Ligand binder design. Structure first.
Ligand SMILES: Cc1cc(C=O)c(OCc2ccc(O[C@@H]3O[C@H](CO)[C@H](O)[C@H](O)[C@H]3O)cc2)c(-c2nc3ccccc3s2)c1
Ligand SMILES: Cc1cc(C=O)c(OCc2ccc(O[C@@H]3O[C@H](CO)[C@H](O)[C@H](O)[C@H]3O)cc2)c(-c2nc3ccccc3s2)c1
Ligand SMILES: [Mg+2]
Ligand SMILES: [Mg+2]
Ligand SMILES: [Mg+2]
Ligand SMILES: [Mg+2]
Ligand code: NA
Ligand code: NA
Ligand code: NA
Ligand code: NA
Ligand code: NA
Lengths: 1021, 205, 202
């Protein structure tokens, strides 16, 4: 009767931050309770650790009070059969909610809507007699969102909160031999939801592994592994503290051995009994074993050397009771004289933020996706990962241990939507709920060498509980620095200045919580700490503008030790249209209101882990080989701290305007932090016109655990020589003829005709034989389809006037009509010259003037000169160029300039000057929110169908007009228009991306000059 | 000195609950709720995290909590050797003036020697000294000579004020002063409840 | 039904250091709720802060499970009239224990003896309708040793621990005009007693 829903639900433990668990067992590092120690040493399956993953029974309810009493005793008939782990939103039982800062529930702590979607999970399963005759059988829920009560065979077992750490209950007194039934009631909302306001999809359910674990009643209850070192890391001591539960007897002993492969490195044995620690003595139920290790192989992201520690609990006559084990990484993390050191060397953090997200499975993680993520990170020169913003699936720490990534392990506390952010974290009544999210994280993950920094959470202001839990970590685990960004990124609760979206040079002096220039921040009086941005370079849509500005600063300033990009993956989810074709959805696409629309997609990769163009810009700026060139001598500098270049060649190409002249390979032999000089063989020196370019790639000839053979890890380019063309063009056999109507200037030469409209003043049409070439005239364009960074948080409902898109719209940029001022024709000796002048106006104000000359000569070549004025007091325009819709649709695009991938003025360092030839499909970037895309800059020649354009321009070319892209909110609703839209710009504004809620394009990349000039030639082939 | 209601003296070791994160909730409410009630009283000059409970990580957490929420008062705590990371004052109990008692882990140095240990910056104020159990306070003069000579010796608190004797009545209802065991309580520590400068009725010793 | 001793005592909240209070209000400096600024300036008595000190009804029990359900609905005939505040050991109901270091109970945290002396305190008292028509009426327990459950008019209000700091509960929705009855069940031992091992009389 005390097990009835009526009694258990009436206490309302999910609306009370004083009750975060009932009858829950203590946290600890991962256990398998092996009963053979060779099994433990090789990490083979334990037959004492069963999985309960698979088909469970599930039934949804609008509120826990709606659940019938019958569900404890017996399976509900209208229930469904369902795979666990899962998020019940991903099965369609209610909507996932995407909201950023605003809580998805009324802010009224600690209370929760009476409308509280409840997930009723049931499982009927078998248990051997062996597990009930001796020992302790427990159940382990690795992740339950957001709180739950647990029944077993109709009797009540316990209650748990915190959605991203494992909850364990003792089931021994509840299970019978044979058939048993678990009953798990999961609540979407609980008082814990107030500390779980991360900017992510809000889902729920049993979304991580469920397991049964058998241990003997006399058991290893906890174990801690530390590694001390001497000054030069030539000697280490491994200290291993082992705690036990159950009856202490004098015959009990512990052995801990250290293996590296099948070599035993050290071993020690002791009975239980610790040092005297205070006046009452010591821990009779603990022992610490110290093993010596001479010349230990050290752990790093560059070389993840692992040992394995085996902890045997046995009797003195040798009988094994049980064994536990963990991977060991010999590494030291200290902050010394303002620098974060790993093994005595200052790290430079090539980091990213990574959520647990899958476009199909939601927040359920799998080995294949974790490994795919770690490979893609390591292949793009990433060093480290921030668990934003909760403890991860346990397997993640093991994969970073072995593949080699530095992990920031972050507590599951975010109170972003509270006003002020400080509200709960400064309140002592929330210290208990917060302490268990911090302490239980450390208890579980404190043996992973991949974990180098503890984080107290994300965006929860700065409360006195932060200071309390900061000191708790320092006391319990000095091994690792503690960091936290909240309350101005330099509070007393952080060892590291960890700002989010601090800019390189410009201050953002917000009251109470300013973001100083990261360079200025370091020099503030009394400030001694390193600075590592917890989040920088917001990669929402077409972004990572100015990425190179950060990395130049990181390399120049010792105490700037890098940062973590926001973020790794688009939090897109999959929906199916009427035919069952999938499309990527975002905020509001599930009926979820209110919602924050595109803001869930901030990744360097799409949800299917296809890279965005920004990923290579990251790969290039984060590379571990820096280059200089003086003469034909290359200085290679290694930014590796621990390894030589023992898997690296340097390939080199010399090419003249795309044409390769000379090649070669040189072996790379650079010490960590060292230099190697390479003299190149006599390079080609042609008197030919054009730019001579040297290109070097670094190539890993041998496969790694994380890369294939021939993987490219770094590159650089230099212009060697240029020879200006001085040869006169070949004369023509014919003079182009001008025909003058009242309405048009038309020009004929051979099979070619050019039509100029004298009312509009534009090139209206062009003929090669009978075949017309244009569907839309060639007109100036001063606008682009707004990028996420141009929109910011502006919406139709609540406009932000300071966003770029709004300043443009308010100034009439997007609705400005061209007014023809001048349209004249002249006949010269060898050519016809059309001169034009338009003014673009909006409600009486002249925004732009464009003066052109079109010069069509005997060779069938149209030379266009453009001279634009921009009013000093209108907002600086998005671009300055022309655009037309071509009739042609060709299958290939061929250009000489920066590529091969999409590149913009403040994001073109990774791009390389060469001849690029791609399919037209690859000239469009399928951002889920459509915008301006697919630009390539610094291009001298563009070829498409019969057309050639030469000059010095930036272009994009697609089946999608800037107008369609602007007016369309998802990529899956775009339709190919007739023909091909071509944007050729003399000048194009930066894309920004330091953040995406305020203007972030830096002045040097704004079009503020006032007068602009550019020159094209349009050609037939 | 406003002291939190935390003492875990009988644990083995004294550290057992105060170093356990599962007891940090119970312990934080006894520290935080004290500060919230008594923070406005000028007579309170120093907060104390409790008494004789070893030195656990929960002590370091709650030390920093008080510093953050009330910087106007130092924090002291004697547990775990009187000079832990959770005390702004060296507050030993029964540290002698000239003689060292070098107990393992938790030594009671000479108060004069204690000041000059390498890296030791803090004042020293004995949270308890001169145990006043019956005929005692021998050598009390030796403390005050040392207190006056040494600037960083800033005194102490005598243990203690009142005999904790209770009145009992015999078969005919005569009152008499009772101590440990006089109520059938077993086990007990007999006389050791009477440590006062004054008798329970406030008569001076 | 979920106010019965059977249900509330079932949870054994005194043997669980994850539950040190239920429905207890936040702590704060001393309040009097003066409705005249001169009274507050001169620290004179406040008509909005009354004492419930005086003659209460009390009954001793060897264990909380020995307390009859009767006691929440109705005063026990077997009970005695006793003055509050008081320690029930000073009235002769059981022995005060003097132990220095060794705990007076078996060291087995967070558990305490099944034989756990419980004091059942009740008081019948009047509340003027003035207090219930507007505003918040709370009860303040400046000190209760070791832990307690509180009933008002048979309905359960909350639970509290820490023997040396005030426990306050909102009683506004529990009180009726005229005669009201508080039922206070005080446990000698609780998980809180593990943190209350001061060398003094227990
Ligand atoms: C209420 C509030 C909070 C913060 C935050 O403190 C904030 O400034 C930074 C910020 C951080 C995270 C964020 O949302 C996401 O959160 C994710 C998960 O954590 C990732 O961390 C990413 O950072 C991110 O995509 C959004 C904004 C602003 C500001 N608004 C405006 C608007 C206009 C002009 C100036 C400002 S200043 C307001
Ligand atoms: C486990 C343990 C703790 C402590 C303590 O740290 C201790 O030595 C100091 C002590 C402190 C208080 C105390 O009891 C009273 O308790 C009161 C209220 O709490 C006040 O604290 C007063 O201080 C006090 O009169 C009694 C002894 C000893 C020692 N045992 C022995 C026995 C023989 C020889 C040397 C030693 S050393 C062991
Ligand atoms: Mg709760
Ligand atoms: Mg946030
Ligand atoms: Mg309790
Ligand atoms: Mg004591
Ligand atoms: Na640097
Ligand atoms: Na976002
Ligand atoms: Na090499
Ligand atoms: Na002095
Ligand atoms: Na004493």
């Amino acid at each position: 009767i005390t097990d009835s829903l009526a009694v258990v639900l009436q206490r309302r433990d999910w609306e009370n931050p004083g009750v975060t668990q009932l009858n829950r067992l203590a946290a600890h590092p991962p256990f398998a309770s092996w009963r053979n120690s060779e099994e433990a040493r090789t990490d083979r399956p334990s037959q004492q650790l069963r999985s309960l993953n698979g088909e469970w029974r599930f039934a949804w309810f609008p509120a826990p009070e709606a659940v019938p009493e019958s569900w404890l005793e017996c399976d509900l008939p209208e229930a469904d059969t369902v795979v666990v782990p899962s998020n019940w939103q991903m099965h369609g039982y209610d909507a996932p909610i995407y909201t950023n800062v605003t809580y998805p529930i009324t802010v009224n702590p600690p209370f929760v809507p009476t409308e509280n979607p409840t997930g009723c999970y049931s499982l009927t399963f078998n248990v051997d007699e062996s597990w009930l005759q001796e020992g302790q059988t427990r159940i382990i829920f690795d992740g339950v969102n957001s709180a739950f009560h647990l029944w077993c065979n109709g009797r009540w077992v316990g209650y748990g909160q915190d959605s991203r750490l494992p909850s364990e209950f003792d089931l021994s007194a509840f299970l019978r031999a044979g058939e048993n039934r678990l009953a798990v009631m999961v609540l979407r909302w609980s008082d814990g939801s107030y500390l779980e306001d991360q900017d992510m999809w809000r889902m729920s359910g049993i979304f991580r592994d469920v397991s049964l674990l058998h241990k003997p009643t006399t058991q290893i209850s906890d174990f801690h592994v530390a590694t001390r070192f001497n000054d030069d890391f030539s000697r280490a001591v491994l200290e291993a503290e082992v705690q036990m539960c159950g009856e202490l007897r004098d015959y009990l002993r512990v052995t801990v051995s250290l293996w590296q492969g099948e070599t035993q490195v050290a071993s020690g044995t002791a009975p239980f009994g610790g040092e005297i620690i205070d006046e009452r003595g010591g821990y009779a139920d603990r022992v610490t074993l110290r093993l010596n290790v001479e010349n230990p192989k050290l752990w790093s992201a560059e070389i993840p050397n692992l040992y394995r520690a085996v902890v045997e609990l046995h009797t003195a006559d040798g009988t094994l009771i049980e064994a536990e084990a963990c991977d060991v990484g010999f590494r030291e993390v200290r902050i010394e004289n303002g620098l974060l050191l790993l093994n005595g060397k200052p790290l430079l953090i090539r980091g990213v933020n990574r959520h647990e997200h899958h476009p199909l499975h939601g927040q359920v993680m799998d080995e294949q996706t974790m490994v795919q993520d770690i490979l893609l990170m390591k292949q793009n020169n990433f060093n480290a990962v921030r668990c934003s913003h909760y403890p991860n699936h346990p397997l993640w720490y093991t994969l970073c241990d072995r593949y080699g990534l530095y992990v920031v392990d972050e507590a599951n506390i975010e109170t972003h939507g509270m006003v002020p952010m400080n509200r709960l974290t400064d309140d002592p009544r929330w210290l208990p709920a917060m302490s268990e999210r911090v302490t239980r994280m450390v208890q579980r993950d404190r043996n992973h060498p991949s974990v180098i920094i503890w984080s107290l959470g994300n965006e929860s202001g700065h409360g006195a509980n932060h200071d309390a839990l900061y000191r708790w970590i320092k006391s319990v685990d000095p091994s690792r620095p503690v960091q936290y960004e909240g309350g101005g990124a330099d509070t007393t609760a952080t060892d590291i200045i960890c700002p989010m979206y601090a800019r390189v040079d410009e201050d953002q002096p917000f009251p109470a919580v300013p973001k100083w220039s990261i360079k200025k921040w370091l020099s503030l009086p009394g400030e001694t700490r390193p600075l590592i941005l917890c989040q920088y370079a917001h990669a929402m849509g077409n972004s990572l503008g100015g990425f190179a500005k950060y990395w130049q600063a990181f390399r120049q300033y010792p105490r700037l030790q890098g940062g973590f990009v926001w973020d790794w993956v688009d939090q897109s989810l999959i929906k199916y249209d009427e035919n069952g074709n999938p499309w990527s959805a975002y905020g509001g696409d599930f009926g979820d209101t209110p919602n924050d629309r595109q803001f869930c997609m901030n990744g360097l990769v799409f949800a299917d882990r296809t890279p965005h163009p920004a990923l290579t810009e990251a790969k290039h700026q984060q590379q571990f080989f820096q280059f200089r060139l003086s003469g034909q001598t290359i200085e290679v500098t290694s930014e590796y701290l621990f390894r030589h270049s023992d898997n690296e060649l340097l390939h080199w190409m010399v090419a003249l305007d795309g044409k390769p002249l000379a090649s070669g390979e040189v072996p790379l032999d650079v010490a960590p932090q060292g230099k190697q000089l390479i003299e190149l063989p006599e390079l080609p020196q042609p008197e030919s016109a054009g730019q001579l370019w040297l290109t070097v790639r670094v190539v890993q000839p041998n496969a790694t655990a994380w890369s294939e053979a021939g993987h490219i890890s770094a590159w650089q380019q230099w212009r060697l020589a240029e020879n200006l063309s001085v040869t006169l063009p070949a004369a023509s056999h014919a003079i182009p003829h001008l025909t003058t109507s009242e309405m048009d200037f038309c020009i004929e030469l051979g099979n070619k005709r050019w039509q100029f409209n004298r009312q509009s003043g534009f090139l209206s049409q062009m003929w090669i034989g009978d075949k017309k070439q244009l569907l839309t005239p060639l007109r100036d364009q001063f606008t682009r389809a707004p990028l996420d960074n141009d929109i910011g948080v502006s919406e139709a409902t609540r406009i932000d006037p300071n966003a770029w898109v709004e300043r443009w719209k308010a100034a009439g940029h997007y609705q400005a009509e061209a007014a023809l001022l001048q349209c004249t024709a002249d006949t010269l000796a060898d050519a016809v010259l059309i001169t034009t002048a338009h003014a673009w106006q909006h409600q009486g104000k002249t925004l732009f003037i464009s003066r052109k000359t079109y010069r069509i000569d005997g060779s069938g070549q149209m030379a266009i000169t453009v001279d634009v004025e921009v009013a000093s007091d209108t907002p600086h325009p998005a671009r300055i160029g022309l655009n037309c819709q071509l009739a042609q649709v060709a299958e290939r695009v061929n250009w000489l300039g920066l590529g091969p991938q999409e590149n913009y003025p403040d994001r073109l360092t990774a791009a390389c000057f060469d001849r690029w030839d791609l399919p037209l499909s690859d000239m469009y970037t399928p951002y889920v929110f459509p915008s301006e895309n697919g630009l390539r800059c610094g291009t001298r020649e563009l070829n498409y169908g019969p057309h050639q354009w030469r000059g010095d321009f930036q272009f994009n070319i697609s089946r999608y007009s800037q107008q369609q892209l602007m007016e369309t909110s998802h990529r899956h609703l775009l339709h190919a228009e007739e023909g091909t839209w071509l944007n050729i710009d003399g000048f194009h504004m930066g894309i920004g991306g330091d953040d995406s809620w305020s203007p972030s394009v830096s002045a040097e990349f704004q079009l503020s000059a006032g007068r602009y000039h550019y020159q094209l030639v349009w050609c037939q082939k």
